[PDB]
C-alpha positions as a printed NumPy array, in Angstrom:
array([[235.098, -41.131, 134.472],
       [236.034, -44.341, 132.558],
       [237.871, -47.441, 133.858],
       [238.987, -45.861, 136.904],
       [235.68 , -46.209, 138.659],
       [235.705, -50.006, 138.85 ],
       [239.331, -50.369, 139.936],
       [239.832, -47.013, 141.836],
       [236.398, -45.999, 143.011],
       [235.764, -49.436, 144.438],
       [239.222, -49.896, 145.766],
       [240.32 , -46.35 , 146.646],
       [237.02 , -45.743, 148.476],
       [237.365, -49.052, 150.162],
       [240.708, -48.327, 151.634],
       [239.462, -44.745, 152.738],
       [236.291, -46.087, 154.459],
       [238.424, -48.94 , 156.141],
       [241.098, -46.289, 157.165],
       [239.364, -43.121, 158.094],
       [235.766, -44.387, 158.142],
       [236.684, -47.424, 160.239],
       [237.9  , -45.139, 163.093],
       [235.181, -42.654, 162.251],
       [231.991, -44.782, 162.46 ],
       [233.168, -46.029, 165.74 ],
       [234.225, -42.632, 167.168],
       [233.727, -39.719, 164.626],
       [230.663, -41.076, 162.718],
       [228.85 , -37.846, 163.576],
       [231.152, -34.959, 162.838],
       [234.594, -36.446, 162.185],
       [232.687, -38.431, 159.613],
       [234.12 , -35.919, 156.962],
       [237.75 , -36.937, 157.441],
       [236.941, -40.079, 155.38 ],
       [235.079, -38.286, 152.485],
       [238.19 , -35.999, 152.484],
       [240.581, -38.691, 151.623],
       [238.368, -39.617, 148.589],
       [238.232, -35.878, 147.69 ],
       [241.84 , -35.587, 146.63 ],
       [241.886, -39.05 , 145.131],
       [238.836, -38.3  , 143.015],
       [240.758, -35.257, 141.605],
       [243.328, -37.549, 140.256],
       [241.227, -40.53 , 139.224],
       [239.292, -37.873, 137.255],
       [242.069, -36.379, 135.151],
       [243.528, -39.971, 134.816],
       [240.805, -41.963, 133.134],
       [238.211, -39.367, 132.031],
       [240.96 , -36.97 , 130.664],
       [242.882, -40.039, 129.639],
       [241.54 , -39.37 , 126.09 ],
       [238.734, -41.791, 125.502],
       [236.18 , -43.234, 127.797],
       [234.539, -46.572, 126.574],
       [235.387, -48.955, 129.336],
       [233.402, -48.792, 132.617],
       [232.5  , -45.408, 131.541],
       [229.047, -46.541, 132.037],
       [229.596, -45.815, 135.679],
       [229.499, -42.191, 137.213],
       [230.874, -41.724, 140.61 ],
       [233.81 , -39.378, 140.807],
       [231.777, -36.435, 139.207]])
């Protein structure tokens, strides 16, 4: 992706780990540990078509996370 990694990857993930992963690590860290990775799954789908499909990747594009 492009610029969405820095802004979205770092933030979106952050809020997903603090929300679903906070409860998980504590309780679900074994199995339920997926519920978190899930929140980021859907988000990634957007953040992908948004910045990478945006039309041109030059800023932050040096970072690959979503895909």
